[PDB]
Amino acid sequence: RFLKVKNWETDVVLTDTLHLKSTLETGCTEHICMGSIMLPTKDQLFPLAKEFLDQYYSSIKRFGSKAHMDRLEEVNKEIESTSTYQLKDTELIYGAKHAWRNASRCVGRIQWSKLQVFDARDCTTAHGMFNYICNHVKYATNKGNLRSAITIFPQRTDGKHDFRVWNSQLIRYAGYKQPDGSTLGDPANVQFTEICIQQGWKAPRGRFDVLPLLLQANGNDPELFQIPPELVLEVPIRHPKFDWFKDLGLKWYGLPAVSNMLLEIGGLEFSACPFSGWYMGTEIGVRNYCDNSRYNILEEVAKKMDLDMRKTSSLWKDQALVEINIAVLYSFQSDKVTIVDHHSATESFIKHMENEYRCRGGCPADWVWIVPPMSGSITPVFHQEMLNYRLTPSFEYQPDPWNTHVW
Amino acid sequence: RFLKVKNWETDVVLTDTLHLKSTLETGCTEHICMGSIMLPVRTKDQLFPLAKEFLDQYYSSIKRFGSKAHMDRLEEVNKEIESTSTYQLKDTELIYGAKHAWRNASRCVGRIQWSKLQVFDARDCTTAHGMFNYICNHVKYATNKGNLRSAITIFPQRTDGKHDFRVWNSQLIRYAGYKQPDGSTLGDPANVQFTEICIQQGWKAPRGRFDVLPLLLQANGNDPELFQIPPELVLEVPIRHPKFDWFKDLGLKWYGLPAVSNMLLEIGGLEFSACPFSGWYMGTEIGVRNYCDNSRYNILEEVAKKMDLDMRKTSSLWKDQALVEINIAVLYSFQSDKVTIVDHHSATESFIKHMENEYRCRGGCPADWVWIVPPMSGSITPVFHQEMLNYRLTPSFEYQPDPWNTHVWKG
Numbered sequence: 001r002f003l004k005v006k007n008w009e010t011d012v013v014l015t016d017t018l019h020l021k022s023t024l025e026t027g028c029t030e031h032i033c034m035g036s037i038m039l040p041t042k043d044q045l046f047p048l049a050k051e052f053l054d055q056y057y058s059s060i061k062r063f064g065s066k067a068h069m070d071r072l073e074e075v076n077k078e079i080e081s082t083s084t085y086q087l088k089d090t091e092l093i094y095g096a097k098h099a100w101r102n103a104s105r106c107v108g109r110i111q112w113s114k115l116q117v118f119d120a121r122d123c124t125t126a127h128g129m130f131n132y133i134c135n136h137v138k139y140a141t142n143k144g145n146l147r148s149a150i151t152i153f154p155q156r157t158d159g160k161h162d163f164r165v166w167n168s169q170l171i172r173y174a175g176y177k178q179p180d181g182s183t184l185g186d187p188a189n190v191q192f193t194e195i196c197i198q199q200g201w202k203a204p205r206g207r208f209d210v211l212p213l214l215l216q217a218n219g220n221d222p223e224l225f226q227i228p229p230e231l232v233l234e235v236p237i238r239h240p241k242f243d244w245f246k247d248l249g250l251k252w253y254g255l256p257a258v259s260n261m262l263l264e265i266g267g268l269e270f271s272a273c274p275f276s277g278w279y280m281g282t283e284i285g286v287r288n289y290c291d292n293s294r295y296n297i298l299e300e301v302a303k304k305m306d307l308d309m310r311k312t313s314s315l316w317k318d319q320a321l322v323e324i325n326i327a328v329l330y331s332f333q334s335d336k337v338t339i340v341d342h343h344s345a346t347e348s349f350i351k352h353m354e355n356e357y358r359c360r361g362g363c364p365a366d367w368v369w370i371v372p373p374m375s376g377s378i379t380p381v382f383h384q385e386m387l388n389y390r391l392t393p394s395f396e397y398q399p400d401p402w403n404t405h406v407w
Numbered sequence: 408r409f410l411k412v413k414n415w416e417t418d419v420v421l422t423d424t425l426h427l428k429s430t431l432e433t434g435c436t437e438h439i440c441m442g443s444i445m446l447p448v449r450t451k452d453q454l455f456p457l458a459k460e461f462l463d464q465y466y467s468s469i470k471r472f473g474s475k476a477h478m479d480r481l482e483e484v485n486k487e488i489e490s491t492s493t494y495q496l497k498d499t500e501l502i503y504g505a506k507h508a509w510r511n512a513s514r515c516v517g518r519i520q521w522s523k524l525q526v527f528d529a530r531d532c533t534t535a536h537g538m539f540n541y542i543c544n545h546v547k548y549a550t551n552k553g554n555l556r557s558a559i560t561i562f563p564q565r566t567d568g569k570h571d572f573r574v575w576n577s578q579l580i581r582y583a584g585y586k587q588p589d590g591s592t593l594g595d596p597a598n599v600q601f602t603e604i605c606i607q608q609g610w611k612a613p614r615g616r617f618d619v620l621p622l623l624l625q626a627n628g629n630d631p632e633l634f635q636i637p638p639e640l641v642l643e644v645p646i647r648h649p650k651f652d653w654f655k656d657l658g659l660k661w662y663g664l665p666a667v668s669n670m671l672l673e674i675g676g677l678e679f680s681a682c683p684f685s686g687w688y689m690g691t692e693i694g695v696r697n698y699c700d701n702s703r704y705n706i707l708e709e710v711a712k713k714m715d716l717d718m719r720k721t722s723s724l725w726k727d728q729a730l731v732e733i734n735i736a737v738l739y740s741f742q743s744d745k746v747t748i749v750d751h752h753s754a755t756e757s758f759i760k761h762m763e764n765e766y767r768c769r770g771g772c773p774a775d776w777v778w779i780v781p782p783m784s785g786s787i788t789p790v791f792h793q794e795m796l797n798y799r800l801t802p803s804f805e806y807q808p809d810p811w812n813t814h815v816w817k818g
């Protein structure tokens with residue numbers, strides 16, 4: 001019941017007490033581990049509020065204070081009368097930071113306390129949403145010196161008035177099915193692209209077209225907006241040694257900004273809460289560029305390098321992989337757009353993890369997601385035992401709105 | 408109950424029913440996943456159901472379930488258990504059992520080969536000298552002049568836990584590690600403790616970087632005894648690189664035969680505490696882990712220096728670049744010397760086919776994603792994108808305590 005995690009590289013052992021505050025289910029049982037599975041009322045509401053407010057007031061060394069009791073009382077009143085309650089600005093900021101802190105699949109959590117929270121709870125229309133998102137994008141981008149941010153739209157009420165950003169990220173490239181049977185652009189975005197066209201977007205049918213935002217306010221029908229092109233910072237990809245690399249015509253956007261997740265704080269649900277940080281190189285170079293079901297460029301790069309692609313054992317894929325990832329990091333650095341390599345990031349996460357165990361009694365971490373998609377065992381996280389469990393406040397997955405939306 | 412797994416690269420969905428036969432625990436609960444945790448004397452009471460479960464499976468597998476032969480065998484074992492407190496497996500059951508322990512090994516990417524396993528029955532062995540002989544024969548047969556063959560040698564099962572057969576080595580063939588007074592390590596740091604035990608037991612250490620350890624063999628609960636595997640039986644491969652001529656001068660080699668010797672084989676409730684097994688290497692085991700772990704030979708820097716990579720910032724990915732060249736070298740060297748080896752692309756691709764075949768024919772394939780995914784180039788191998796279900800089936804291979812912590816010394 002008091003769990004130990006061992007680092008097999010360093011022999012360092014940490015004791016986890018924090019997991020006993022866990023609440024949501026893991027998908028696992030004593031008979032079966034689902035660790036590798038990607039997606040495993042007033043009565044209900046007040047204990048959630050209380051649990052949250054208890055931890056909030058503990059964090060400000062005011063547990064059991066009158067102001068603590070007062071707040072608890074006030075919230076209980078409000079839930080009883082109005083069936084929901086409103087978070088204080090302080091509570092909202094605390095909650096959003098802790099959702100990030102609790103994100104077990106995020107390697108970048110050493111940064112968790114430095115998050116800029118934009119309160120967009122006063123937003124009522126999709127136009128309003130668009131303005132808030134432009135401001136987020138511009139703030140977070142900061143001319144390439146990226147700053148973590150989250151913009152938080154009105155909370156769920158009855159479920160029939162949800163705010164939703166239909167896009168999975170604020171910034172992504174379109175994907176088009178060709179008559180050639182092939183796929184043009186990002187294959188991961190074909191369906192959403194269709195919905196944009198369906199909703200009237202005039203697609204330029206290019207390879208790196210920035211998708212428009214599809215914004216839904218107050219449970220109304222979603223509307224289309226185009227992010228001002230001058231606010232979308234992009235990095236052309238070149239290689240420091242290979243002059244030919246630029247001829248691939250590759251580029252990527254600077255701002256990773258997740259927009260389809262649900263923020264839960266104190267039992268309240270924020271269905272529209274886009275958040276952003278900065279990229280770890282492998283996200284672009286390994287996954288976005290080299291996944292078979294993505295831009296899938298390995299072969300083309302390999303050919304340009306004149307590798308023996310006859311036999312897997314020449315490790316031509318591994319060689320091209322490295323070079324592609326070298327180019328990504330080099331291109332971002334050259335353009336002064338913030339980026340972190342997988343060595344630096346995983347090293348930071350180890351130190352964060354030690355800080356968290358020391359100051360919080362633990363740190364929930366999903367090893368399957370934390371270990372980078374290349375060079376796994378030469379990063380310190382590979383040798384680090386981790387315990388995965390769910391703490392709230394939290395970011396959750398939610399269904400794509402087009403399967404949900406009564407038009 | 409039905410469980411589905413999805414491959415996120417291909418969208419192929421498989422349905423697992425085999426997990427319904429799962430037995431032992433995972434370490435996980437509804438509240439906590441311990442999927443990345445490395446390490447999560449028996450009464451007649453518990454024994455017969457375990458025997459029975461096993462024999463029902465064996466008899467189903469040979470399409471003789473419910474047969475008189477099946478029924479007589481259950482009867483025979485039941486009686487032998489109530490008479491003698493244990494029972495002996497038929498040779499057929501032992502072989503079936505050993506193959507299935509491998510088949511069930513959720514951490515093994517090489518399981519496409521599971522039905523091809525040479526089983527050496529050493530249950531008649533009584534002494535450490537006898538164990539040495541059996542192990543030499545296993546090594547010679549398995550090595551096969553570089554054309555490696557999978558094999559397992561099975562020594563007598565546990566009785567009261569006071570007469571265990573144990574191979575004290577973690578692998579049949581491994582290199583000594585020596586801690587120096589200046590705190591540096593000569594040879595393989597992983598094997599420092601065991602090397603020290605060998606030396607204390609009388610082993611004369613050459614004290615070089617690649618000294619093959621002696622066997623430390625325990626028969627029938629007696630104190631273990633030292634034996635040197637005949638050098639001519641230990642196949643090794645000098646590591647060179649197809650393009651970089653300086654790579655040979657790193658002075659690296661490795662042995663050809665990976666042979667785990669510290670695990671416990673459970674079959675029908677019986678416990679085989681000494682059951683060394685061997686196959687052939689996947690390149691990354693050597694090129695990534697053995698050579699490049701900071702806690703092992705740790706050669707990344709020396710290699711990267713010689714390639715003259717920019718080592719001033721990790722962002723140059725000098726470690727990644729050197730890592731690849733080393734793994735190219737391992738594969739090159741083994742192939743050149745005609746010693747069996749498989750790259751991580753081939754091995755993971757074969758595993759996916761095996762896994763799918765298993766779902767279709769067996770109703771599932773327990774697999775530990777954390778172990779299955781190779782330690783380099785994870786997501787450009789198909790296993791990375793494959794959801795897996797980890798559970799425990801018997802017969803199985805299990806961890807056991809290192810014998811030096813538990814052995815009662817006779818003296």
Ligand code: HEM
Nearest residue numbers: 100103105106107108111148150275276277278279280395
């Ligand atoms: C500031 C630098 C950051 C870095 C380097 C970073 C890094 C990463 C990486 C590599 C992943 C795996 C993503 C994937 O493979 O798709 C991830 C996931 C995640 N991150 Fe972070 N992140 C950062 C900031 C943030 C922020 C600001 C938040 C929230 C406020 C956040 C919350 C999450 C969540 C919830 C996931 C899981 C996503 C999912 O399950 O799909 N991250 N992060």
Ligand code: HEM
Nearest residue numbers: 509512514515516517520557558684685686687688689804
């Ligand atoms: C024939 C070629 C084989 C290949 C290429 C192969 C591949 C692998 C690899 C790469 C690992 C991970 C090792 C590590 O990271 O320490 C492993 C583990 C394992 N293998 Fe296989 N293997 C083979 C044969 C066998 C055989 C013959 C058996 C048993 C009869 C077996 C049973 C196991 C078990 C029980 C593990 C888990 C080891 C542990 O938990 O420490 N394998 N295998």
Ligand SMILES: CNCCN(C)c1cncc(CCc2cc(C)cc(N)n2)c1
Nearest residue numbers: 108256257258275276277278279280283
């Ligand atoms: C299963 N993933 C497919 C969709 N995808 C590529 C994706 C999913 N989930 C999250 C992200 C972005 C991850 C991320 C987020 C933030 C804030 C920073 C960062 N460096 N990466 C991307």
Ligand SMILES: CNCCN(C)c1cncc(CCc2cc(C)cc(N)n2)c1
Nearest residue numbers: 517665666667684685686687688689692
């Ligand atoms: C605890 N981890 C380090 C111990 N170690 C190096 C190790 C552990 N477990 C297994 C092996 C050898 C793995 C193996 C076994 C067999 C039969 C074939 C193969 N290719 N690899 C080595």
Ligand SMILES: C[C@H](O)[C@H](O)[C@H]1CNc2nc(N)[nH]c(=O)c2N1
Nearest residue numbers: 382383384385443444445777778
């Ligand atoms: C902590 C973590 O479980 C540990 O480093 C594991 C990860 N996956 C592994 N996978 C294999 N094949 N072999 C290993 O030793 C490990 N080590």
Ligand SMILES: C[C@H](O)[C@H](O)[C@H]1CNc2nc(N)[nH]c(=O)c2N1
Nearest residue numbers: 036037038368369791792793794
């Ligand atoms: C099946 C498996 O869970 C899936 O491929 C996971 C593996 N680990 C991952 N890790 C990260 N960071 N991101 C991912 O999308 C995935 N995909």
Ligand SMILES: [Zn+2]
Nearest residue numbers: 028033435440
């Ligand atoms: Zn689990």
